[PDB]
Enzyme design. Structure first.
Site, PDB file in Angstrom:
ATOM      1  N   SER A  60      42.891  36.593  42.103  1.00 48.68           N
ATOM      2  CA  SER A  60      43.733  36.798  43.294  1.00 48.68           C
ATOM      3  C   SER A  60      45.224  37.041  43.021  1.00 48.68           C
ATOM      4  O   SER A  60      45.979  37.323  43.951  1.00 48.68           O
ATOM      5  CB  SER A  60      43.626  35.599  44.236  1.00 48.68           C
ATOM      6  OG  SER A  60      42.314  35.431  44.716  1.00 48.68           O
ATOM      7  N   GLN A 116      35.263  35.302  51.705  1.00 49.24           N
ATOM      8  CA  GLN A 116      34.669  36.345  50.890  1.00 49.24           C
ATOM      9  C   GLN A 116      34.068  37.404  51.774  1.00 49.24           C
ATOM     10  O   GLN A 116      33.568  37.102  52.851  1.00 49.24           O
ATOM     11  CB  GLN A 116      33.586  35.774  49.963  1.00 49.24           C
ATOM     12  CG  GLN A 116      34.082  34.695  49.019  1.00 49.24           C
ATOM     13  CD  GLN A 116      34.859  35.261  47.842  1.00 49.24           C
ATOM     14  OE1 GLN A 116      35.058  36.476  47.737  1.00 49.24           O
ATOM     15  NE2 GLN A 116      35.300  34.383  46.944  1.00 49.24           N
ATOM     16  N   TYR A 146      43.317  31.723  54.454  1.00 50.25           N
ATOM     17  CA  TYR A 146      43.305  32.506  53.226  1.00 50.25           C
ATOM     18  C   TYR A 146      41.945  33.175  53.026  1.00 50.25           C
ATOM     19  O   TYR A 146      40.902  32.524  53.146  1.00 50.25           O
ATOM     20  CB  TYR A 146      43.666  31.600  52.044  1.00 50.25           C
ATOM     21  CG  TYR A 146      43.718  32.320  50.725  1.00 50.25           C
ATOM     22  CD1 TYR A 146      44.842  33.065  50.353  1.00 50.25           C
ATOM     23  CD2 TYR A 146      42.646  32.255  49.832  1.00 50.25           C
ATOM     24  CE1 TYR A 146      44.891  33.732  49.128  1.00 50.25           C
ATOM     25  CE2 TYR A 146      42.689  32.914  48.613  1.00 50.25           C
ATOM     26  CZ  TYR A 146      43.813  33.649  48.267  1.00 50.25           C
ATOM     27  OH  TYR A 146      43.846  34.290  47.055  1.00 50.25           O
ATOM     28  N   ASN A 148      39.827  36.870  51.234  1.00 56.73           N
ATOM     29  CA  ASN A 148      39.750  38.197  50.616  1.00 56.73           C
ATOM     30  C   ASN A 148      39.422  39.304  51.596  1.00 56.73           C
ATOM     31  O   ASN A 148      39.832  40.431  51.400  1.00 56.73           O
ATOM     32  CB  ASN A 148      38.710  38.228  49.509  1.00 56.73           C
ATOM     33  CG  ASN A 148      39.052  37.288  48.374  1.00 56.73           C
ATOM     34  OD1 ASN A 148      40.211  37.134  48.019  1.00 56.73           O
ATOM     35  ND2 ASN A 148      38.047  36.648  47.816  1.00 56.73           N
ATOM     36  N   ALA A 314      41.875  33.267  40.472  1.00 57.44           N
ATOM     37  CA  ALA A 314      40.718  32.861  39.689  1.00 57.44           C
ATOM     38  C   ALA A 314      39.585  33.874  39.808  1.00 57.44           C
ATOM     39  O   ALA A 314      39.475  34.552  40.819  1.00 57.44           O
ATOM     40  CB  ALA A 314      40.236  31.476  40.121  1.00 57.44           C
ATOM     41  N   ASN A 339      38.305  29.245  34.194  1.00 55.42           N
ATOM     42  CA  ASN A 339      38.789  28.860  35.516  1.00 55.42           C
ATOM     43  C   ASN A 339      38.949  27.340  35.609  1.00 55.42           C
ATOM     44  O   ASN A 339      37.975  26.629  35.775  1.00 55.42           O
ATOM     45  CB  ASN A 339      37.827  29.358  36.602  1.00 55.42           C
ATOM     46  CG  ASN A 339      38.329  29.067  38.000  1.00 55.42           C
ATOM     47  OD1 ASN A 339      39.520  28.810  38.204  1.00 55.42           O
ATOM     48  ND2 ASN A 339      37.423  29.103  38.976  1.00 55.42           N
TER      49      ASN A 339
END
Length: 357
Positions: A60, A116, A146, A148, A314, A339
């Site tokens: 990210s 996601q 937050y 994606n 990550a 990670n």
């Protein structure tokens, strides 16, 4: 200066041992100048060591490139943050999309877009069906969640006027002017030799393809290019390209406030000097992934040089972190092929940069 060497080895060495990181690269930016450190292996099995040429998955941290590319397009006059998402996607006709702007997408405030993009989404029609049937939890601009699927869609839409794909727009308008010559979204065959393996539960892994991966978590880069990325975001005014200089500045503008944090485009900011407990706790996923009420900053605050600017990233096999303070010409890049917990990254970075202040 040996001071830098000291504080870095005293901070990172125990970090590596405790978290069992196979390979790591670190750049400290002190007074504008980069200082590099490398540990361990890019590839355990072949005993291939980490070098300054080694490619890591940024995860990210990719979103900061997406934010700046978005800013560059605003500066080009190709888009405006107040434009409706549907202005660049006419086929998106659903009821719920009415008040949702590019700004909302870019800052995770569209109303509950998921973390996601669903694995099921594998085509253009799949992606439209995903967004067409998505049902917001909240009104636009009330909660930061937050995601994606949010900034990822922002990236895909933001480049639509350029006529270029997100990938080519990113390379030609951001990477290339900043001489990030070993920064890739798609690692080409002659460079795969430099591409570190990531490690997860003992196994060597690389990030899997996914919808909007280029926009959300798909950049690969070296410690040197990442040091250049930081220096550019610290001092945009020394960059030839004026829309890019301007885009860099727009990504560090403050559009929202939640708690002590300000949301930019990709970048996140806090006032400097910063409360270290705040960024360490804040970086943990129980807080970082949680829905939080937001306060609109109107007009958006122009990029504040007295800031802690920063982003974690990550993938399954990689962990990255970038932080800097423009007013102090002070910054850090940490790239690792495991990670490991975010708060450990931020604590290490803090202790290094605090000692150098």
């Amino acid at each position: 200066p040996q001071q830098i060497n000291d504080i870095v080895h005293r901070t990172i060495t125990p970090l590596i041992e405790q978290q069992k990181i196979p390979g790591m690269a670190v750049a400290v930016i002190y007074q504008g100048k980069p200082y590099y450190f490398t540990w361990g292996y890019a590839d355990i099995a072949k005993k291939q060591p980490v070098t300054q040429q080694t490619l890591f998955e940024l995860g990210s941290v990719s979103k900061t490139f997406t934010g700046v590319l978005g800013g560059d397009a605003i500066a080009r006059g190709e888009i405006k943050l107040s434009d409706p998402a549907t202005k660049y996607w006419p086929e998106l006709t659903a009821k719920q999309w009415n008040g949702i702007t590019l700004l909302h997408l870019a800052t995770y405030t569209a109303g509950g877009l998921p973390l996601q993009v669903p694995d099921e989404v594998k085509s253009s029609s799949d992606l439209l069906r995903f967004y067409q049937n998505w049902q917001p939890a909240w009104a636009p601009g009330t909660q930061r969640l937050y995601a994606n699927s949010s900034i990822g869609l922002f990236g895909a839409l933001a480049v639509k006027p350029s006529g270029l794909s997100f990938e080519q727009a990113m390379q030609t308008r951001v990477f290339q002017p900043l001489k990030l010559n070993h920064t890739w979204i798609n690692v080409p065959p002659p460079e795969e030799k430099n591409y570190a393996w990531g490690y997860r539960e003992g196994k060597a892994v690389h990030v899997s393809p996914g919808a909007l991966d280029a926009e959300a978590y798909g950049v690969k880069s070296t410690i040197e290019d990442m040091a250049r990325w930081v220096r550019s975001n610290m001092n945009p005014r020394d960059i030839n390209d004026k829309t890019l200089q301007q885009g860099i500045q727009l990504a560090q503008s403050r559009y929202w406030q939640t708690g002590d944090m300000y949301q930019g485009l990709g970048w996140e900011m806090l006032d400097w000097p910063v409360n270290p407990d705040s960024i360490i706790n804040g970086s943990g996923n129980k807080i970082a992934l949680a829905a939080h009420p937001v306060k609109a900053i109107t007009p958006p605050t122009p990029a504040v040089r007295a800031s802690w600017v920063h982003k974690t990233g990550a993938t399954g096999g990689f962990g990255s972190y970038v932080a800097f303070i423009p007013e102090k010409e002070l910054g850090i890049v940490m790239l690792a092929n495991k990670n490991y917990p975010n708060p450990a990254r931020v604590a290490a970075a803090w202790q290094i940069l605090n000692a150098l202040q």
